[PDB]
Write an enzyme that holds these catalytic residues in place. Sequence first.
Site, mmCIF file in Angstrom:
data_model
loop_
_atom_site.group_PDB
_atom_site.id
_atom_site.type_symbol
_atom_site.label_atom_id
_atom_site.label_comp_id
_atom_site.label_asym_id
_atom_site.label_seq_id
_atom_site.Cartn_x
_atom_site.Cartn_y
_atom_site.Cartn_z
ATOM 1 N N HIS A 155 22.753 7.944 -15.100
ATOM 2 C CA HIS A 155 23.858 8.892 -15.066
ATOM 3 C C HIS A 155 23.965 9.657 -16.369
ATOM 4 O O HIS A 155 24.143 10.869 -16.356
ATOM 5 C CB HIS A 155 25.191 8.182 -14.827
ATOM 6 C CG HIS A 155 25.284 7.491 -13.502
ATOM 7 N ND1 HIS A 155 25.744 6.199 -13.385
ATOM 8 C CD2 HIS A 155 25.035 7.924 -12.245
ATOM 9 C CE1 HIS A 155 25.743 5.849 -12.113
ATOM 10 N NE2 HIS A 155 25.323 6.878 -11.398
ATOM 11 N N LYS A 193 37.602 0.816 -0.649
ATOM 12 C CA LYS A 193 36.701 -0.051 -1.400
ATOM 13 C C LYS A 193 36.974 -0.002 -2.900
ATOM 14 O O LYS A 193 36.513 0.901 -3.596
ATOM 15 C CB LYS A 193 35.243 0.332 -1.128
ATOM 16 N N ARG A 243 16.516 10.710 -7.223
ATOM 17 C CA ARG A 243 15.394 9.826 -7.507
ATOM 18 C C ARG A 243 14.257 10.007 -6.494
ATOM 19 O O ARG A 243 13.085 10.069 -6.873
ATOM 20 C CB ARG A 243 15.882 8.369 -7.558
ATOM 21 C CG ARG A 243 16.624 8.074 -8.882
ATOM 22 C CD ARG A 243 17.968 7.356 -8.699
ATOM 23 N NE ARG A 243 17.919 6.318 -7.669
ATOM 24 C CZ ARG A 243 18.959 5.573 -7.303
ATOM 25 N NH1 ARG A 243 20.140 5.745 -7.884
ATOM 26 N NH2 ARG A 243 18.818 4.655 -6.352
ATOM 27 N N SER A 300 24.067 1.782 -10.128
ATOM 28 C CA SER A 300 25.212 0.921 -10.410
ATOM 29 C C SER A 300 25.183 -0.341 -9.549
ATOM 30 O O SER A 300 25.389 -1.433 -10.067
ATOM 31 C CB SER A 300 26.529 1.672 -10.183
ATOM 32 O OG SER A 300 26.602 2.837 -11.008
#
Lengths: 154, 154, 157, 158, 157, 158
Positions: free
Chosen positions: E17, E41, E90, E127
């Site tokens: 990040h 969440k 990615r 993460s």
Amino acid sequence: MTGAVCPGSFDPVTLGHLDVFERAAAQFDEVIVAVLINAGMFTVDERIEMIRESTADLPNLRVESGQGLLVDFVRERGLNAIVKGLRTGTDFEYELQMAQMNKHIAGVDTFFVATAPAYSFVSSSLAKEVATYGGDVSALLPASVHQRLLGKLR
Amino acid sequence: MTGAVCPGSFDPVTLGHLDVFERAAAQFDEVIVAVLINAGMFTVDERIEMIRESTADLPNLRVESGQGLLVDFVRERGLNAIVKGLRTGTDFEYELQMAQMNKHIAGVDTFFVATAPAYSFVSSSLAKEVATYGGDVSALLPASVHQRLLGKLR
Amino acid sequence: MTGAVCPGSFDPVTLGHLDVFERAAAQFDEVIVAVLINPNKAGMFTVDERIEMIRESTADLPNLRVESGQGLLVDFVRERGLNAIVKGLRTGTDFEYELQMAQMNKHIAGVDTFFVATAPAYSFVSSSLAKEVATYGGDVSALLPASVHQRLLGKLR
Amino acid sequence: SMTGAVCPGSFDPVTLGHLDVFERAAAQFDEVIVAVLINPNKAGMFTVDERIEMIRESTADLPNLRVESGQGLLVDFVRERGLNAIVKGLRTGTDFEYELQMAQMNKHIAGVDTFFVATAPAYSFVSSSLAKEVATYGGDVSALLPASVHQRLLGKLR
Amino acid sequence: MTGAVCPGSFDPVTLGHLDVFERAAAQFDEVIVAVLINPNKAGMFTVDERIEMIRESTADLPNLRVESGQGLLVDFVRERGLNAIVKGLRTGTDFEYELQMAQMNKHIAGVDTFFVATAPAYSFVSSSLAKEVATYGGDVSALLPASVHQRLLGKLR
Amino acid sequence: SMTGAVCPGSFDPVTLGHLDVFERAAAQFDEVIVAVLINPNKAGMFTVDERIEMIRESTADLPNLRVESGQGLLVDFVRERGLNAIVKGLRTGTDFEYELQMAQMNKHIAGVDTFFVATAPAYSFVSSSLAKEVATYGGDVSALLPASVHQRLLGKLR
Ligand SMILES: O=C(O)Cc1ccc2ccccc2c1
Ligand SMILES: O=C(O)Cc1ccc2ccccc2c1
Ligand SMILES: O=C(O)Cc1ccc2ccccc2c1
Ligand SMILES: O=C(O)Cc1ccc2ccccc2c1
């Protein structure tokens, strides 16, 4: 008595290739780097020497040239595994077709290994191309190879 | 003294998995099938027994359960290779992230092997789903497993 | 009367191609296999040999016929009163380049494209790879119609 | 002014997909340079002057965009203009993987960053090469190319 | 005045990040890191903890600021007088789902999205994977800012 | 009449991308059945009657199309109607790979073929799920859904 063959043109060998060789050598008793005889930059002899220079610390690895079907090269040496490095899913699908064909015609298995992250973007072709226009690729090639490349261009 | 670990939940083991086990067993001196303890259909004991039943002809393969990090399971057994079967390039990219992480944190290598064409479309999940609604999956599972599956549904 | 065109060079036709032909013939009232004539890259088999190999392999498909052509595929399709193409696919990468072509063909001529996944057993055969393997003495007899395999051996001698 | 990006390609010819990317770059950077790559070893369909003219005529409404040709390493073209960003349009995941390799190489050798933007849906399927191939055999690509290009293309083919 | 928004949950922020943040800050006059507040969440770190970890890691980026929000991202972007999003990528699979989102965001609000490839060294960190590895005692210290790693160890005890 | 195909989905709600696929199937097969999957264990946003009504209202111009609900195995729905073809729309290579698995399984267990068609570019980015999510937080999806759907969707959300 395990073993695998690592195939390619290696024109020239890169640190991405060397990483794959080292991982194969760590997991199989015997590794053979198979150098294709096929419009390239280095002769087959030069390509072999550059690989031998860069793999001196791998006692169970040898380097040999050949042509024709890779599976015949593999089987004639008593083996039936290929180890190949992969960068992308696009690579997986094309190599996949070949792996399945090779299994079908000769019973030879193919094991794919993910590129080390640091070498995800290096290829013999892009390295040659970038070096030709003056870009610094010294960090992407064995020290050996890098000096040899400079020689061919200049 | 070479070796590899083949990981999964195997709920249940399919012929696609068995094909990968057989290829790993052919190329490494020692293979360990690692069964994850993790909402499934079969208990861990049932999953282990079904794999043991289907791999009786592979003398150098054993089956063990575990949890936590796969790399700890691998390293605690003196090994540092994982062998995993792959069907698509989509599979390659997600598994790729994991392989690179596993190499980073524990130095454990991952070798991927292409699915046999005949099992390209079978997964534990789709087999269970199709069988549940009455579809014939007998050709996609070891004879063993197939009868056990019929039992769980009926 | 429904119909579709199945295009290719078919040099030579493989069992992967035949599987697509059979599925198309089962779902459309007529199917035309369109064999490309290419002035530049002359392949292994002549257009006539390629047509004959397809006809032998599709003898039991009465609603399928084999024809040759060149130029723009959508012109071939519309000239025959059709507006659908049927093509086999093996990979996601296959889908991406073929996708571009399908959208282009729909845009320029209103011709639609239907894709079908190859049977698993033929997912790795292609005309080019079969020829390459055969050239060096590999056995591709399980991947080709029987008559094609015979003809291929002859051209190799 | 301060921020800036280079939009590279062979633009042989420029398409509406390219123009979309130019417009989006020009809206987000103070200056944009369209970099027309010329291979000294292979002539395209259009000469460098023709390629540049076709781009200029279809970007007249973009005051902060200019067009220049070059050859060799893209990162040298970018850095010699005091910039260090490339903006490139992308259509597919396959597009992303090969362009990914070149973007990481370009960052490695010259510290130049690459920003990718998704092409507009209406142009997801035009490329210079496919437009030329379709036009060669008579297909209608008029809605895929700017007015500055279409009839010049037909002229080349005839 | 040019500008872009870099969105995410950043639970916690990784070096992947940070690499994107640095590249965005180098190319746009202002960058806003937008931290998602999600009622459903609840993750590992509170929104305030996540903002603090980002601010520590971006202390040398004077044109970058960190803010939280929820709801539609394009509303957040336009409310701040901007119309660009910058996101790291990615894989090709990443590009396909993110592509759908970018085209949707352009369609509904005229907001553009610029994607940048992660540095090779951080191509495999996320993460979620960092947390999972750390939970079982794996060493992810080379993949996280120094302060994040310290905080992560604390939450695990 | 003779040839026929089934177009499956949850259609919760139907989108313009789906309608494009229905129209293209109806142009190429003598009959088309839109198969609305209902999960007896999870209610969608719209009930089965609502889903069917929204599809019928936007397919009134397709005389050879009909709409039916079902559950369980798709191949049983297809075969019990004397058909053996599925037509499904696809947006990406990732779409192709997972749908590939299901198509090969469906052929294996029931001899049912699957034909995929590329969605129209203008709809490459709408899905039922993303339309619902965007509308939930107030985004404008009116150009992505038929008239039979958009305000019914807003009503559900309010
Ligand atoms: O990669 C291939 O399949 C072609 C190839 C590459 C290297 C070789 C080396 C020795 C003999 C045959 C070889 C074939
Ligand atoms: O595949 C993974 O990375 C998760 C996994 C799967 C199987 C395991 C078996 C034993 C111990 C850990 C395991 C982790
Ligand atoms: O697939 C293409 O677009 C090229 C192609 C292939 C086969 C053809 C057969 C007859 C006429 C035109 C043809 C074009
Ligand atoms: O990426 C998305 O579309 C979801 C998202 C993420 C971060 C946000 C931050 C502030 C406001 C809205 C946000 C939405």
